[PDB]
Nucleic acid binder design. Structure first.
Lengths: 91, 98
DNA sequence: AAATTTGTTTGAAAAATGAGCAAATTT
DNA sequence: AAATTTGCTCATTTTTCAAACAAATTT
């Protein structure tokens, strides 16, 4: 029912799937705890950065560096794709 | 002084190692495995909307978690994410969060 | 009773789109 | 030699933005 998941082991030594979103939720549950008052200026860019990099890296591994199949696979414009690659300096 | 914390280490998750020890690893790596897994299962089939799929799985808990933190305040939340207050409100309606 | 936030509108700036093309590169 | 992708434009559509400002709610 839910296509993006990650692997998990319990004390009885059994492996089992759970959603990526539960990890994102943990990460952040953790970010906030380890802050006290200190404000946060721009978290939407931060998390986006942390998620766009391993997406781009993984599809360019998969499409063998084919920028055109990549873009089509993601549903974004071929120019958009170049631009984001430039943002992260992987080209 | 203060020890250096790279950005890869600002958002992390609990993992268990080959010596059965508990330990923190980047969210980055959770996102890799998720997709690495997604592909193996895909097996030959095609896609046309992977950006929107990943974007969704990630926007939804980021939004959820931030509103709990500002006890529902949409002005501070949008300020603390650093996005327009009307894009936030737009974005929330998309996921049914109101 | 203040001060702050929500629910709207409006118009301008920035980003994303599709379509074109010659030169380079893979098939 | 032919087919396909790159690198670079243009210009139009869509999304994001800040600045209004009543009316509603929280301090």
């Amino acid at each position: 029912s839910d296509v993006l998941t990650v692997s998990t082991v319990n004390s009885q030594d059994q492996v089992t799937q759970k959603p990526l979103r539960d990890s994102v939720k943990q990460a952040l549950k953790n970010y906030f705890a380890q802050l006290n008052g200190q404000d946060v200026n721009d978290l939407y860019e931060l998390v986006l950065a942390e998620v766009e990099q391993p997406l781009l890296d993984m599809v360019m591994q998969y499409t063998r560096g084919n920028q055109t199949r990549a873009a089509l696979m993601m549903g974004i414009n071929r120019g958009t794709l170049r631009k984001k690659l430039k943002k992260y300096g992987m080209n």
